[PDB]
Design a protein around this nucleic acid. Structure first.
Lengths: 79, 103, 52, 49, 99, 79, 52
DNA sequence: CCCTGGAGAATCCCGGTGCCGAGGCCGCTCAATTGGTCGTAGACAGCTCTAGCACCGCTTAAACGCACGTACGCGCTGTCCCCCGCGTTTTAACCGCCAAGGGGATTACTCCCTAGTCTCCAGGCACGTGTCAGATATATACATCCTGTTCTAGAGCGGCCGCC
DNA sequence: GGCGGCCGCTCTAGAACAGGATGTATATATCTGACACGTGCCTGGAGACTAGGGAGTAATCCCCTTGGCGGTTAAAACGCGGGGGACAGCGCGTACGTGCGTTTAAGCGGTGCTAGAGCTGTCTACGACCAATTGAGCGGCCTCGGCACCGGGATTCTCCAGGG
């Protein structure tokens, strides 16, 4: 698996900014948003990996993702 | 290795952008596609530990959490843009918002 | 959430109604400021300078 | 005492010149006059020459 | 003679260098203490405060205000300005979620 | 006790902004800083008041303020 | 903290040195981001555009 | 250059299907409920004593205010290149469908070390105290910033020279 | 004899550079006040023991995520037209930087007093635990209806063109 950071497409980031009420979207916001999302995923998925390794499980459940989001003050409901 | 190689409508910018803002702000469905985000999640996870799997619901929760976090970050970025007497966002506004947030 | 559903005139409570109920109330906004609600989006508000 | 007393052209000397730092005071005893504060410091230094 | 007449900004930089390396408390102790007393009077009329409690409140408030001023200055530089503004403070509080 | 919000004087706010590396300080930001400080104190001191009321005490100790700041993610050391 | 105290020509650990040690290390700054340190101040860093 | 009338296209209210997730029902069983019984944390009474509340001298660094001006906040103009709306053709997304095989979930046998005591003792805590580095103090001394004077480069002007 | 072109001369200003100014960096002198060492305990963890219970491990099982396809229409992406806005630049100004006069309260030190938190008994209901029991919560099945979907139609707000 290589070049998967480009899976988050440019109109996907455009629609995400449209949900946030952004009037105009620059052409350099896409790489920065991809980097921010990569950093956030590299934190949350790593925390979920530690949670799964603690429980002697080989696949990561949604509850561990919920715990990893909750421990950083970003708690998620519905899972 | 062995190889040598009549008049169109012409909508002005901003009005359709506000139309999309109104359409997606009242909307509910997920903006980011499923499999590209899932493949990015697997690619990120393979750097930490190999032979790892994610269930469908865990990918769903990660996608919704990331979408909400990026929507809040874009809201703060747009607020800083209007705060800087602008309607176009810049990556330095995103960096400033991340610095203020402490992350 | 029922009031928000009646404003949208829907009978069944959907996560959009719950997200609107949390974000509309100021007390619930302060209580759940660090809370992410799935399948709910955000408030449909527009800045004053955005409209032409 | 007073508000203006200096042997040279005064600058509202107080027994120290106002509007100046503390490292400019001299306490010598000479012939001191007022002359309406050297006629309003020479009518504002020749109206800001 | 003429006065030295420091240009606007040099004494600001001198104060920034002086206070960024000194750990003394900038807010005076008694006015902050009395502000704490009248704030706590709205919740409990018969209440007392230890000296170290006022010390901790003063240090926490000073650190929070210094962080808010840092965010305000960074937002001002982001907004092509060097003067901190109340709208910059409002933006910093809204991004931090305290507004 | 009235009008003690003016006890946070103008040079105190000046020094507070100088610690934060601020070049220029406006004339209208003193009232805004006083309001922000009033809101922060009306949160923290009220939390300490609740702690002291639960602690069967009538004097607000430094420790109660310490966990009152800790519970909001603003933990203070040294008291 | 001892390194910061030697940088300040000090042989006794003062909370200014502890604050400098905490905020200088990136890992300690991220770990103690939600931490208030008494009698420590902040880092003596000045922005590039602030210089004359 | 601004106001007003007519129409293209995204959006909103509405009639009909139905369907697949939501509401109600059958057990029943495992977690919720009832009664007694103690160890025990907790409510209450008296002592106290060490830290906080109120007022006082005083003095002195901290703070309000007024005069002045120059960095900077704000209003205004252009522009061009950066982003948006849309035509078109690829492009991978999602549901449709199929097995797989590691892997979550459950049940049971067993086994070590953790719950809980007994005793003590050696490391941890209260108190006393010589002490050694930090702060006050001040002439001396950095140290960079502000400003005055001069150096040298650039544009404007005038005198001189050749040509028609 | 008149005039354009050329070169020297003086005027003007940007800027490198040196000197004065004032708030800090240091060099002792000396206070000084907690810092850490020593002492005396003494109160909590460690050796050792009793007992047992929840996980390590094995087995099953069934379940659910990954690979792996065509299909098809939603949409990413390339590109043309163009359009309104970020920013360089310039001008107005005022309002906030700098500096002391003057006032004014912050803080150091002192004294008195009680507001009340530990501290020690005391006595008392209260919740974990053990028999004994029991009743609707939940998995699952039957039913059913609210809004996604599909169009149909429509008001309805928005842009383009004409007139004053």
């Amino acid at each position: 698996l290589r070049d998967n950071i480009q899976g988050i497409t440019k109109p996907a980031i455009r629609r995400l900014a449209r949900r946030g009420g952004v009037k105009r979207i620059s052409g350099l916001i896409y790489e920065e948003t991809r980097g921010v999302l990569k950093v956030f995923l590299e934190n949350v998925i790593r925390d979920a990996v530690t949670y799964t390794e603690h429980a002697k499980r080989k696949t990561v459940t949604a509850m561990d993702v919920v715990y990893a989001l909750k421990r950083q003050g970003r708690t998620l409901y519905g899972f | 290795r062995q190889s040598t190689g009549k008049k169109p409508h012409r909508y002005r910018p901003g009005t359709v952008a506000l139309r999309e803002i109104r359409r997606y702000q009242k909307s509910t469905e997920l903006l980011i596609r499923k499999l590209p985000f899932q493949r990015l999640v697997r690619e990120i996870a393979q750097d930490f530990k190999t032979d790892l799997r994610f269930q469908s619901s865990a990918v769903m929760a990660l996608q919704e959490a990331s979408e909400a976090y990026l929507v809040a970050l874009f809201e703060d970025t747009n607020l800083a843009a209007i705060h800087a007497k602008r309607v176009t966002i810049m990556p330095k506004d995103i960096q400033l918002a991340r610095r203020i947030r402490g992350e | 959430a029922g009031n928000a559903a009646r404003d949208n005139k829907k009978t069944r409570i959907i996560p959009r109604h719950l997200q609107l109920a949390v974000r509309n109330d100021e007390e619930l906004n302060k209580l759940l400021g660090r809370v992410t609600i799935a399948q709910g989006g955000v408030l449909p508000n527009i800045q004053s300078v955005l409209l032409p | 005492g007073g508000r203006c007393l200096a042997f040279h052209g005064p600058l509202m000397y107080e027994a120290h010149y106002q509007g100046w730092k503390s490292s400019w005071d001299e306490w010598v005893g000479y012939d001191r006059i007022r002359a309406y504060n050297e006629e309003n410091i020479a009518m504002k230094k020749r109206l800001a020459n």
